[PDB]
Symmetry: none
Subunit: 91 residues, 14 copies
């Protein structure tokens, strides 16, 4: 399958346990493109990094999942991680 399920993991494994919670919280209110669902709170507020990567690639696709992860990471301040994620996904 696509390798985008790995580039996301390498991006979410570099987050500390404190800013992973911030990522999950901001995932609850980020604007979404039409036709895509939103992860429910009950599952979102308890997943670890691996489950979160699986769920992100499941609800969204490779391209949109990577793009959404990059946008959320950039909006919360982390610039180098979003940059390396975009570098890994685009080429």
């Amino acid at each position: 399958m696509g390798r985008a399920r790995d580039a996301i993991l390498d991006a979410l494994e570099n987050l500390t346990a404190e800013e992973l919670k911030k990522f999950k919280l901001k995932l609850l209110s980020v604007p979404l493109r039409e036709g895509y669902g939103r992860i429910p709170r009950g599952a979102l507020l308890s997943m670890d990094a691996l489950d979160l990567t699986d769920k992100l690639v499941s609800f969204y696709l490779e391209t949109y999942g990577a793009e959404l992860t990059a946008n959320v990471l950039r909006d919360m301040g982390l610039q180098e991680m979003a940059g390396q994620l975009q570098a890994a996904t685009h080429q």
Copy 2:
């Protein structure tokens, strides 16, 4: 068949594992109108969200099931899920 069973599921999936137990506990003593039975403790304290919503639409009807869920949600404090459920059910 009515879509009110999906609305309850969308509201019970936004509760974490902690206030789901609180919801189930509050369901054991909430006042009920006449002609409706009460879910026994033996099964109530073990269902997850899916079993709970199915069982709620089983004992109570769609309209009363949604109304009772909204009442219990307001009673325990959550005004956002209750408002979402009212919006989904009424119209």
Copy 3:
């Protein structure tokens, strides 16, 4: 031949395997009208849904069989199936 043998089936085939046992158990102690017999334990505690519907329409007639099934279902709390059966049989 009356169609009431079908409306009962649609009510008993929507019960889970656990609550079918509850239905059969409650059928052993429900009050009965005069002139109607009671299903013996040896056969009742082993029937599946289809045999149960056949025996219910055999001992009790169409109207009384449907009414008794609705009463037992409503007594054990299941009001959606009871209402469905009442709507199907009354008209």
Copy 4:
């Protein structure tokens, strides 16, 4: 047919699966008045609530079955279910 088989069920469905095992274990050593047999251990440790109620009303009569169930429930601590059982059976 007496309704005491129902009142027992409402008492055995209102207690969790963890303490149903405790009830069945207490049932192996509770003193019995003369002329009444004891449920064999091979089947007593595998029955769920429904078969337990049926077996209790079969081995012991309605009055003594309800009395024994109330006594066992009181002995193991639960006096809410025991209280409602006594209220239902006596009147």
Copy 5:
């Protein structure tokens, strides 16, 4: 013809498929008064409730057949069917 052949039937149709085997097994060693033979083990372990009632009223008379059935039923614990049999036969 005496009605005692019917009452025994009403006692053996309330026994499940597992208690009927226990009844037939106990019938091979129950003490018997003088002048009455014992059912051979070849046919006893293969007949159903109806054949069992017929042959019980055949070997033993109506009064002794009912009394023996009640005694065996009390021996294995089931004192509800035994009580019903006594009530039906004595008066």
Copy 6:
């Protein structure tokens, strides 16, 4: 014979034990085309993926079965399995 009975399995076998339960639950309320029946609740809430795909292709036709599976899958959010299901069935 149509090969899309194999595609549906590939979509139902990629779901975890928790979201398969949600799929079965949402299959109880999805709108249906005229002339197509609804799977009874008693058997639907107990079958696994293999029985589910067999009965999905049995009750509804081949193309409609695939399309309904895709509709339900997108409704609950999973648009990765739904997309590959469309890719398999359409061409």
Copy 7:
């Protein structure tokens, strides 16, 4: 001779024993045209697929037997069975 008895056998042989019993049950109450008899309960609830096919082609004619079988199959939900049955019998 007509080959409709082959098409009916093909339709009844591809459905499991569980819904075969349901088919035989609904054959007891399906509406019939005037001049056609009803299969008695004593034989209907015991015959297998082969005997059922033979007696369906016996009591009713080839055309009416096939059409009634298709009607019963659609009524009980299986729309794949009836489709191939009508395809075979019509041409």
Copy 8:
């Protein structure tokens, strides 16, 4: 059902996790009036507020449960929470 099961919960959620342990420890030696049992240590030393209030209303009744909770709360020092509990319970 009485609302005092909800009054107790409101008392056990407004006290911190450090003093919930103190409450549970004090519950192990508080004097009890005759006829009432004592919660075993193994279960008591592990429940959270929801399980604790459920089991408090289970072992003791509505009135005695509320009274015992108020007694323990005053004993350990918290007078505001006990006063709130009396205000909720008595009227």
Copy 9:
């Protein structure tokens, strides 16, 4: 007729299904006196408690059957049932 066919039953109904299989397995290799045969594997590993008691009293005798059952029970650990069987058989 000897009552040892009953006491043995009381020993084989007071042990669970996981101990009955162990009893049957150990009955395969227990030492036997001369002149007594061994139950074949094909039938022994399939019969339940009742058939086991009957065939135990058939192959062996009353006294030897009871003694062998007690020896197997004590070898597999259960001392309470073995002592009960001793008390029942010796006097």
Copy 10:
């Protein structure tokens, strides 16, 4: 008679009960060569490994039966049993 009926059995006994169902399910939709019939669904979904082996060698010949079994095994993923079957049958 060829021994190829054994090589199939050695392939159907080394796969678990969960994936025997998947094998039987894919046996209902695998493409078939001209002149060969399809096993009826009613009997397919109930046969065990031995009955399945006999049926496979009956409907299809030894060569085509082995080839079809290998193809179905490779399609469903298991390429360890498929290679073993191919090695056993080809030489």
Copy 11:
């Protein structure tokens, strides 16, 4: 039946889950007087309090079971529980 199976439970429900593991571990190497077997490690390291007390009264007798439990409890340091057990058992 003796009440010793009741006292042991009162001693095993009053100790935490952390030290129940210690009790079960100590039970694997405690010296045993002759004529009594040792509980196998496979089942001993998985039972809860109820199964443990049933197994203890099964392998050992009432007197020896209580004495051995008290000895093990004193061995690991818990003196008050052992004193309670001795007081309940001896008189």
Copy 12:
């Protein structure tokens, strides 16, 4: 009959359910002497300790069965049960 069927059982009942699975898995690849068959994977991965001992003594003889069990036990690291089996079988 030899006692080696018991010494194996005492070795397979003294190891937990987690490492029983490891034992069964290692039994699929252990080298075998000439002329001895290998247990098929379908039945091996589902049987418990009792069935495992029975089939171990069936496929392999007493001497080789005990030797193979000890070899597998030392292979998977358990030097205690293996030594106990050595002592039990040799003398």
Copy 13:
């Protein structure tokens, strides 16, 4: 049978539970050579180490199974385990 099913186990049993999930997640997107299937997501995200080794040697062969496990272990960082697996497999 090849010993490679044991080399893989020693590699998968020597890594913690937190990184076993990472291994199973990386197994969902690793490139595969042509002709080999992919483990379905539903079963892959639930099996433990033993089932994982069994199915790894099932879908892939001895050589390719070991090679794929080594490649995945190398990719996710663990160089010691991959080196040990390569040393065990190659010679």
Copy 14:
């Protein structure tokens, strides 16, 4: 059974939660005598004191288990615990 499974516990129960990790880590590289296996990292880094003592006495024997524990304790600096372990085990 030997008492050395107790002394080890008394040596591992006196370890703080921090130095227990150091003990388990040094257990991964301590040299072992030939014929003894090494505990895998998967379980070694998750067991607490009780499972660790059981595992040590299982993989190694009484004498070697005690000796290895003493050597590891001396290596990591803790001398008084090693001394008391020697005093307990040797005499």
